[PDB]
Amino acid sequence: DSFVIRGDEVRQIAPGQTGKIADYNYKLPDDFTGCVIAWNSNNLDSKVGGNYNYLYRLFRKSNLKPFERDISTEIYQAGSTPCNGVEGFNCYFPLQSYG
Amino acid sequence: VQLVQSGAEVKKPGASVKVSCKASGYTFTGYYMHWVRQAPGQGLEWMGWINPISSGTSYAQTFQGRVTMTSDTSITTAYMELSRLRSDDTAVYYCARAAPFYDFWSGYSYFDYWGQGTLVTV
Amino acid sequence: ASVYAWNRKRISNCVADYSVLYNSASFSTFKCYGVSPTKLNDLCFTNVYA
Amino acid sequence: IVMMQSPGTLSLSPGERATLSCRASQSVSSSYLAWYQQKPGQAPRLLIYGASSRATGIPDRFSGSGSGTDFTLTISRLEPEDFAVYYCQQYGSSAWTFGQGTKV
């Protein structure tokens, strides 16, 4: 399974972790068997002005199951009022860029 | 944090104007880009905003139906296009940065950075 | 407050919605001990100290 | 909503204190009230947000306070660069509203 995250989030790619990546993007099972390999790619995945082609999920109704892949872009309801697909107060776009 | 807008424009009534705003010094998609108008001798009027991550927008009822906002994250630039220009649209147009609605400490309630005003004459 | 003289706020007799805090994008650390961060709204406490 | 500032014009000597007022037609959360400074020929800059919090780069000569429908901006000592137009700004109902502005 290959993907890009920022340095501080590398620790989240492990069993028993929590956080925006562990919970909403890429979840590993507590009984995971395997190896997590990472390297700095600042010379590839960064650009002047900011590289906005790498996204992560910031909001979700619930945590992901192990190896679940959620790629929806539906507006997240933070409040008690239905968003009806329109972002605004208490209605968030679920993804964000690393830049 | 810097916001750099295009130069002044002169348009005839019925024409459309597109004002750009290039952002730098921050994560472009991490903030909303707002546009604020200031007619000569008048105060500041909020027009609307765009959220570059999705290009979702919201407009003031005053401009809704005439103004379209777009953005391009690859060049961290926001655009505001105001159509059907009238003589009373002569104003200095500013781009301004504010936090997204999910900011815990309500950074969306105000504009912390402004670009240089761009004068549009109609 | 300074860490050597930290400030304790006693919280009682109220409704505690912890999802507002947990689902916030504005915090870099949110680590719960002795309790799941997603079960907090199902629990009742005799007091909360902030 | 209507945000009404007063006085329309404020005139006093450098080195003295000035008080600028902004009244709301309805209650405004302190978290949603901001003050801006606009020098002639320049874009507005943020001075105060959240009713009382100074923006980064703003001198401690500037302070704000208030709640409900009555907010103020205070300049403890006026410098030549403080003789500009000030605005109050409110957020609510998914909209941003500015006052008419006052000139110092």
The residue assigned the tokens 């500015």 is: D98
Do residue A62 and residue C25 have CB atoms under 8 angstroms apart? no
Token readout for D31 is 């978290």
Query: Which residue(s) pair with D3 in the sheet?
Result: D24
Per-residue buried b or exposed e for B31-68, using 16+ beta carbons within 10 Å of the residue's own CB: bbbbbbbbeeeebbbbbbbbbbbbebbbbbeebeebbb
For residues B71 and B84, the answer to whether their CB atoms sit within 8 Å is: no
B74: closest CA of chain D, how far (Å) = 26
Give chain B's length.
Answer: 122
Q: Which of D22, D96, D98 to mutate to test the interface with B (most CBs of B within 10 A)?
A: D96
d(CA D19, CA D9): 11
**Structural domain count of chain B:** 1
Residues of C in contact with A63 (CB under 8 A): 38
Helix and strand tally (H, E) in chain D?
A: 0, 10
Q: Do chains B and D touch (3 or more CB pairs under 8 A)?
A: yes
Bridging pattern class, strands C48-49 and C10-11: antiparallel
Do residue D43 and residue B44 have CB atoms under 8 angstroms apart? no
Q: What is the DSSP string of C1-50?
A: --GGGPPP-EE-SS----HHHHT-SS-S----SSS-TTSGGG---S-EE-
For residues A32 and A15, the answer to whether their CB atoms sit within 8 Å is: yes
Neighbours of chain B (3+ CB pairs under 8 A): A, C, D
Resolution (A): 2.6
For residues D42 and B44, the answer to whether their CB atoms sit within 8 Å is: no
Q: Which of A20, A52, A81 to mutate to test the interface with B (most CBs of B within 10 A)?
A: A52
Token readout for C25 is 């994008």
The residue assigned the tokens 């947000």 is: D49
d(CA C6, CA B57): 43
Q: Do chains A and B touch (3 or more CB pairs under 8 A)?
A: yes
B107: closest CA of chain C, how far (Å) = 11
Experimental method: cryo-EM
Do residue B53 and residue A96 have CB atoms under 8 angstroms apart? yes
d(CA B69, CA B87): 21
Q: What is the DSSP string of B54-80?
A: TTEEEE-TTTTTTEEEEEEGGGTEEEE
C26: closest CA of chain B, how far (Å) = 6
CATH code for the domain in which residue B115 is found: 2.60.40.10
**B43: amino acid identity, one letter:** G
Task: Name the 3-class secondary structure at B26.
Answer: coil
Which positions 54-113 of B are in contact with A (Cβ < 8 Å)?
A: 54, 56, 58, 73-76, 100-102
CA distances from C16 to A61, B103, C9 (A): 19, 20, 14
Do residue D99 and residue B114 have CB atoms under 8 angstroms apart? no
Residues in CB range of D3: below 8 A, 6 or more apart: D22, D23, D24, D25, D88, D89, D90, D97, D98, D99, D100
Range of the domain at B28: 2-120
CATH architecture of D3-103: Sandwich (2.60)
Q: Is D81 exposed, middle or buried (0-12, 13-18, 19+ CB in 10 A)?
A: exposed
For residues A12 and A28, the answer to whether their CB atoms sit within 8 Å is: no
